[PDB]
Amino acid sequence: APLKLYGMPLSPNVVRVATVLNEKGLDFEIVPVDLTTGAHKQPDFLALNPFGQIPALVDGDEVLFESRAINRYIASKYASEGTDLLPATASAAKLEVWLEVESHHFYPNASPLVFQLLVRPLLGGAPDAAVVDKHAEQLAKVLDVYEAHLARNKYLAGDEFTLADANHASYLLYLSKTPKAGLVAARPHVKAWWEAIVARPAFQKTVAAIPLPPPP
Amino acid sequence: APLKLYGMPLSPNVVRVATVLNEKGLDFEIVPVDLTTGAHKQPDFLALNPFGQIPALVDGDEVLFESRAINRYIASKYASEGTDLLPATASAAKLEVWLEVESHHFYPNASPLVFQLLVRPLLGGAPDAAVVDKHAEQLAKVLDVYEAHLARNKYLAGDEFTLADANHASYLLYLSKTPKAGLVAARPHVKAWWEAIVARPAFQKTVAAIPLPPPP
Amino acid sequence: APLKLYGMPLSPNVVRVATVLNEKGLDFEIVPVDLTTGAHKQPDFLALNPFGQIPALVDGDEVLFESRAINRYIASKYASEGTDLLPATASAAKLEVWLEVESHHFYPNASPLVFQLLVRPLLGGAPDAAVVDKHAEQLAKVLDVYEAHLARNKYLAGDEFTLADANHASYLLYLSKTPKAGLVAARPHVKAWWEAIVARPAFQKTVAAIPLPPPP
Amino acid sequence: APLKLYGMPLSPNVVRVATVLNEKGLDFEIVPVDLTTGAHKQPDFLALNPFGQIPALVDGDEVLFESRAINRYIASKYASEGTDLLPATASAAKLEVWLEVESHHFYPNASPLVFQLLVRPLLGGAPDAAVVDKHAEQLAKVLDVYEAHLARNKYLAGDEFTLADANHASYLLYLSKTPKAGLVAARPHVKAWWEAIVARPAFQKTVAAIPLPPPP
Amino acid sequence: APLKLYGMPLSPNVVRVATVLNEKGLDFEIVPVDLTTGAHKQPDFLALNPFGQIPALVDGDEVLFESRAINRYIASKYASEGTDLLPATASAAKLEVWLEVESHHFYPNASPLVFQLLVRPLLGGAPDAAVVDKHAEQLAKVLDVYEAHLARNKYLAGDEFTLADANHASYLLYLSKTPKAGLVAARPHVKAWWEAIVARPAFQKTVAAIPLPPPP
Amino acid sequence: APLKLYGMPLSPNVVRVATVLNEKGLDFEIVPVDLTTGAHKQPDFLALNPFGQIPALVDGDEVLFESRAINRYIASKYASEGTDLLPATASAAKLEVWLEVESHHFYPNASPLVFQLLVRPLLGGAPDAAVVDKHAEQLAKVLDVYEAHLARNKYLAGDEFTLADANHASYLLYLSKTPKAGLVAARPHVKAWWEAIVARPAFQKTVAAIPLPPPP
């Protein structure tokens, strides 16, 4: 049945889930929610996610939160619909290693950059130079390892596109709209790899759904 | 003519300007803009605001940025339309002092709190306890001074509602939707003063325009 | 064949892997390695782990790094040996959600505490009060959610002990040796749940292997 | 009557007020005060400034604090004496925008630099490299915008020297005595603009009053 | 001959040296110096102290910097004049241990507190709550150890007042003028010990020389 | 009798003491201790060191802690055995100044670097770029002063090797095993000076005792 994805359509963490839902060609609606923005604070969304973070997904009777837990659950549960995000042809050792690398090395460095360079200015604040510098450099070192790996593998886990690559898509997308898009562009294989991901029909759909504002 | 307010309708810094535009009963439209979110980064909004921050207001041939510069400009320029946000009956010494107090004591402590407790969770992140603690405490000390002052003055600058009070409205509003709403509630005069501001017809209009999401 | 676990036997991240290897009853040896501690710096371990972090595991021809990637790989690969860390009887939705909760909520708060209160003093430094306070409080909120969950489930994913619980063991162990052991003790179900984990024979073995120093 | 300016004559925030008092040619004395430096802490200056910060100015029966609130009050109150810091010939849109730019972009970056490079060493401490780097870079970006603006305007608000320029003087002065004086020097119009400000007779007087120590 | 002490008479690090010079009853003058405050930056005091920090002391042909290096040098060099700050009757093990404790535990926590609560407000800034909290708590734990020690020893190194105690005096003095003076007062022996130090004639002289401002 | 040095043989702060014990040719054993790593936390090592930090040294009936207090005590107490770490031929002014420089300028910058680049990766963590950058740069400026000094002096205090040089050895050793070893290598005299220290027989012994792991 139509899956319910709770969250703001602009949040890259919501887009990471939408990414996987389109690949699998599953039906779903993105439901925006008032976390606490209603005042007199008496815990409501806390019923879906007790940690009170977006996104959350309701799968019939199942409720899941943690975008990566959701992506993995959906990828194995609906293993047949759409793309096989967990190919048995992909290396299992590489697939598990790169899922964690994204979680612990790419994400923690990619998000602060998207936050300082995209979100803050939209809210009336100037990017924190110290935060940008620390993370741009850390992400650069991280992307040097992706570069050497991708020079030897078409995708993260091997010849085929898997969950490992899809989990990167929303943040690569947002990174490309910042002045730090060069971290990706300057690395040949990272760049090719990224351009291959954007070319994906499912991804095209996902991007199409982001309520991105119009120029000045 | 209809003023153009560039920015996201959810940003409290945009709401601070809308606050003053409704009091003056001026006509305007809030135009959302793509700051850099279009990639291949080649500076567009930078033409309105070279600092690249929201909001910006176009008044015919005039372009202004810095929400407080905009509010003051509009308050003196359209001095007659709607409320007199700069009454000659208000104390000039108090009016100037409390405009700066808001800028240097209230704002710097109120925004981090709104950011960590409202924005971050909407983006998939958990509030930073250290940031919340530092600022809740600093805002508390700041609000103890407002409390003693407001026990002796109906409004910040005196008997009447002025620009000094209006500049606080959007952030008091957002603060009320967080678990730190108590900083205001626990202080009798701050609370009365705030409740008086919400009662204002102009403010009612402003609140009405915020595209606040629906509950879970 | 005997798996090679590269790392210091005292590092909780190495112990998290050993935890899973004993449950599965697999054979392995923990090999301590010189990361860069040999000077004239010309990258050696970087061949196992290009990120240059411990631990790394060599499974015949396979090399994996990221303790959780290693644990998951071993848990599905050697699915039959020893305990079934991935029971098909466990809820799949809960199992995936709690694997991520540990990674994103428990770990990031548990490690700084172990680092400031255990490691630093061993190296001649005093714990940073600000770091301890921030994380003890964040971990406390996190453990309030575990408490409510564990009041309703024997283990994280349900009736049985799974990978989700095992991934917590080394850090719960180290936390218990700090002045913040109370975060666990003060929560009834968290405490029972933890005491159940220590009772496990496999865990007993693991603890037995940590080269913990003798009292003064 | 002779205005009383409470504060240390070396504090740039006190000098920012003195700057405006000399332009207006008003009479005043700078009174140094014991904030809390008398021990057994029982709040005294707190009567002038409840926030307990310097400077404070007593204008007969009026007490004001917040250096910029003081400068604006004096600039409009004594609108005729000395220089017209608020010319009706100056652009009102530019004047309000640049008053805020100084407050939110220049000041927050200029002060940390003066603090780490001038104050700390005088107190036995070494400058924090991270703080200097973050702010020198942020101030640099800020001064690139001043440069483009000043290439098109003689002064911030237009053809004439206004309050907007005067509010910058004390910090430009202190910045020039640091190793980061180059941020100003390297920008042609910023440099010319600054040199024009120092040439002002009123400013000459102000500088003359700072109790600056003698060389080694 | 009259020793030359370079530095501001208000800086507690200069007062720590003056403390020891008066005990020894040596003659000296405190010379205030322009560190870099002369602009066009071309290194002058750097000749006394290449680190460019205050204080520096010129002893005839000798130049020393690092307040504690100066205090120790003077204490052994002029071992006979005035008080024997290095009594052979004092425990040598205790004397060396408490000289380092002051340097590594007391000083690093006492100075941030004096800086945020005394210096910043004098310069127009509000104390950083996070910095005050972190250090007040760390100093509290440190003073609990002094309390237990001082319950068993009249002074740090034993029965007599030594260099170890004198090195604490200026910072205990400044701490007493802050809202955190209670850290000392609340600990019986620390308090008695401190009151004994203030009673010292030499110390009375030292305090007398600090150019402390008059009340409001 | 055989001195007991409490601590981990890998900790550079323990190695700083061992350094001085070998120079003096004293007998001792390095005893590793459980600080709190035994749980149910009821203070044991706290009897040697109430601050609960390593190392501690028991000299018969004497207990000392603070590595530098220990080094100085042993250097004067066993003044005759082995090397005279406190030569009366060395300049007393230079000797005291450089003991403090190491404590306040070298150590605080050298340790964070050893911690982020050596310790963290051994524990499963990535170096913090911001911390490395801040300290590498601060240490660089510090080493520029050592360079100019060492171009004029064979050793820190003069012609002979003293306690001042020995206190640097363990950290210079660890720094050499990091990617920041260049800070030393790139400075001619610092490099020569360091190479002279490693050549020392006593130092050779010390290095020999560090339980450094074998390559991958």
Cβ distance A97 to C66 less than 8 Å, yes or no, reads: yes
Vertex F163, ends F159 and F166: CA angle to 5°? Answer: 95
Calculate ∠ Cα D53-B65-D92, nearest 5°: 85
* Strand-pair category, E56-59 with E62-65: antiparallel
DSSP symbols for E24-85: TT--EEEE---SSTTSS---SGGGT-TT--S-EEEETTEEEESHHHHHHHHHHHT-SSSS-S
The coordinates were experimentally obtained by: X-ray
**Among B48, B47, B62, which residue's Cα sits nearest to residue B3?**
B62
- Tell me the shortest Cα–Cα distance from F149 to chain E, in angstroms: 10
Tokens for E110, please give them.
Answer: 């006492």
Contact at CB, A54 and B122, closer than 8 angstroms? yes
- For B29, the 3-state DSSP assignment is strand
Selected residue of E116, E120, E131, E133 to mutate for chain B interface (largest B Cβ count, 10 A): E133
Nearest by Cα to E78 from E159, E23, E29, E14: E23
Contacts of C129 in chain E (CB under 8 A): 133-135, 137-138
F63 contacts on E by Cβ (under 8 Å): 93
B126 interaction partners in chain C (CB closer than 8 Å): 105, 138
Distance separating alpha carbons of residues A165 and A152, to the nearest angstrom: 15
| Phi, psi angles (nearest 5°) of residue D59 | -110, 85
CB within 8 Å: F179 and C52: no
Coil, strand or helix: which one is A200? coil
Count CB-CB contacts under 10 A for residue E148.
12
Point out which residues pair with F65 in neighbouring strands: F56
Q: Which residues from chain A sit within 8 angstroms of residue B51, using beta carbons?
A: 126
8 A C-beta contact, residue A100 and residue A164: no
Q: CB neighbours (10 Å) of residue E214?
A: 10
Domains of chain C (ranges; CATH) run 2-86 (3.40.30.10), 87-207 (1.20.1050.10)
Interatomic CA distance for residues E148 and E160, integer angstroms: 17
Closest-CA residue of chain F to E108 = F104
Residues F61, F128 contacting (CB under 8 angstroms) = no
* Residue A154 DSSP symbol: S
Size of interface C-E (CB pairs under 8 A): 12
Report the distance separating Cα E128 and Cα C16, nearest Å: 39
**Rounded Cα distance, B127 and D216, in Å:** 50
* Half-sphere exposure (Cβ direction) of B53: Cα atoms closer than 13 Å: 21
Q: Is E211 on the interface with D (CB under 8 A)?
A: no
C186/B65 Cα distance (integer angstroms):
52
Select from D100, D87, D82 the least CA-distant residue to D21: D82
Q: Identity (one letter) of the amino acid at B78? A: Y
The strand order across the sheet containing F56-59 reads F28-31, F3-6, F56-59, F62-65
**E28-31 and E3-6 beta bridge pairing:** parallel
DSSP A63: E
Which sign does the torsion angle of CA C180, C182, C185, C186 carry?
negative
* Alpha carbon distances (Å) from D75 to B102, C45, D87, E66: 20, 68, 10, 47
Contacts of C101 (CB under 8 A, 6+ apart): A51, A66, A69
Could you say which of C62, C96, C145 has the minimum Cβ distance to residue A64? C96
**Binary contact (D32, E214; C-beta < 8 A):** yes
Q: Are F192 and F154 in contact (CB under 8 A)?
A: no
Would residue B39 be called left, alpha or beta, if left means φ above 0 and alpha means ψ between -120 and 50 degrees?
Answer: left
Task: From C106, C131, C93, C135, select the one nearest C193 (Cα to Cα).
Answer: C106
Query: Rounded to a whole number, what is the distance in Å from the CA of E134 to chain C's nearest CA?
Result: 5
Angle formed by the axes of helices B12-23 and B201-209, to 10°? 140
Paired strand residues for A63: A58
Residues of A in contact with B14 (CB under 8 A): 124
The two tokens of residue F210 are 């560090």
Nearest CA in chain D to F137: D129
User: Do the chains contact at E66 and F104, CB–CB below 8 Å?
Assistant: yes
Task: Tell me which residues of chain B, numbers 181 to 200, contact chain A at a CB-CB cutoff of 8 Å.
Answer: 181
10 Å Cβ neighbour count for D81? Answer: 13
| Contact residues, chain E, for D117 at CB < 8 Å | 36
Beta bridge partners of E56: E6, E65
Nearest CA in chain C to E138: C129
Distance in angstroms (rounded) separating the CA atoms of residues E139 and E117: 15
Question: What SS3 state is found at D66?
Answer: coil
- Taken in order C45, C50, C51, C57, is the CA torsion positive or negative? negative
E12: tokens are: 């507690």
Chains A & F: contacts with CB separation below 8 Å: 12
CB contacts, 8 Å: E101 with chain F: 51, 66, 69
* Inter-chain residue contact B129 with C130, CB threshold 8 Å: no
Sheet holding A28-31, edge to edge: A28-31, A3-6, A56-59, A62-65
Q: Which of residues 103-132 of D touch A (CB under 8 A)?
A: 105, 130
Chain B positions touching E129 (Cβ under 8 A) are 133-135, 137-138
Measured between beta carbons, the chain A residues lying within 8 angstroms of F129 are 133-135, 137-138
SS (H, E, C) F129-170: HHHHHHHHHHHHHHHHHHHHHHHHCCECCECCCCHHHHCCHH
B46 touches chain D (CB under 8 A): no
Test mutation, C107, C128, C131, C134, chain B, max B CBs within 10 A: C134
Q: Is A4 left (phi over 0), alpha (psi -120 to 50) or beta?
A: beta
Whether E contacts F, i.e. 3 or more CB pairs less than 8 A apart, is yes
Contact predicate B48/B65, CB 8 Å: yes
Residues E101 and C126: their CA atoms lie apart, in Å, by: 12
Hey, are the CB atoms on E216 and D34 less than 8 Å from each other?
yes
Task: Name every chain B residue with its beta carbon within 8 A of the beta carbon of A36.
Answer: 117-118, 121, 177-179
Whether the CB of A68 is below 8 Å from some CB of chain F: the reply is: no
CB contact under 8 A, B39 and A6: no
Q: Searching chain E, which residue's CA lies closest to the CA of residue C125?
A: E104
Query: Which positions 78-97 of C are in contact with A (Cβ < 8 Å)?
Result: 92-93, 96-97
C-alpha B105/C-alpha C155 separation (Å) is 48
Instruction: Report cis status (omega within 30 of 0) of the bond before D112.
Output: no
Question: Do residues D138 and A130 touch, judged by C-beta distance below 8 A?
Answer: no
Q: What is the resolution of this structure in A?
A: 2.2
- Is chain F touching chain B, with at least 3 CB–CB pairs below 8 Å? no
DSSP class per residue in F64-122: EESHHHHHHHHHHHT-SSSS-SS-TTS-HHHHHHHHHHIIIIIHHHHHHHHIIIIIHHH
